[PDB]
Design a protein around this ligand. Sequence first.
Ligand code: NA
Ligand code: NA
Length: 327
Amino acid sequence: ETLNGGITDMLTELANFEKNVSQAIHKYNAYRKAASVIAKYPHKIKSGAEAKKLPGVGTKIAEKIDEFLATGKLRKLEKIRQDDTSSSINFLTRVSGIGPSAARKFVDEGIKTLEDLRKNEDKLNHHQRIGLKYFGDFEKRIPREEMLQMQDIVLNEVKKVDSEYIATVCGSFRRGAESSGDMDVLLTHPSFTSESTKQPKLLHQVVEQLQKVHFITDTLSKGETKFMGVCQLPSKNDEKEYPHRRIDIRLIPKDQYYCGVLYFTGSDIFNKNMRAHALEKGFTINEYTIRPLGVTGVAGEPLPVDSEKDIFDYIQWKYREPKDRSE
DNA sequence: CATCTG
DNA sequence: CAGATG
Ligand code: NA
Ligand code: NA
């Protein structure tokens, strides 16, 4: 956790590069387990020879540990840091919709900057185009105070559309966090579930509302159960307009709500711990369900849950307010 | 994973 | 359809 940090950290830049610049999924995948194991490793790795010992830890890595151990630097790392090429990728990649794959192509066409992009908006797609157009805003963290305002909006319009809707705004927001990245809303309806063969209007209808009243400004991808978008807090009495926000709405069959609701809410650490416990308590949990685990090795059959409470119950645990869901 | 592109 | 992105 701090005893072998830089090591795990160099590994990480190394790995990241591989997969972002080079295409070395192979190698890339390698730095990773690597970082992962040294990470759990309980001692002060004094040498490469010491790491090699570890599994995942090959001769090359040990090569890299020794040098970095030997000098507070890595040549490769250092050479990688300057390299304009590697920089452009790692950069453009910051635009929504611009991945690495596209990172390469653009650079390879000589687009390597914000301006580059604008100049060539044509080579970008709707998503990439919005991505670039709200470059800044998208980079901006979300203050709780805004979050509550938005939530108030989402919930009011959904209500309006059907008293039967059940929205939940998950994430750290839910966990209490002072700020957030993006607005994540979990959506269901009675009239929608497991067997219940579709009803796409279920998701559409709302999208429209939020768009009616101008909350949602753009579509990233609107599918039949997942809409990826952009929303905005109405600018009050003009002088202070809000930033443009990344909002994501997803339809869920009522018979599956709280499982997800739990889940999306995190934290990741909480999930695992909660997941492992389930397992003890004779069960299994995942994003959609919680099932009675048999002895033969495995077994299923989705237990029926009416709230986040039913779940906890199942695994015989302390109902935890979203707050303490930390770890 | 579900949507998108081309 | 493969392949990318989030
Ligand atoms: Na090894
Ligand atoms: Na991106």
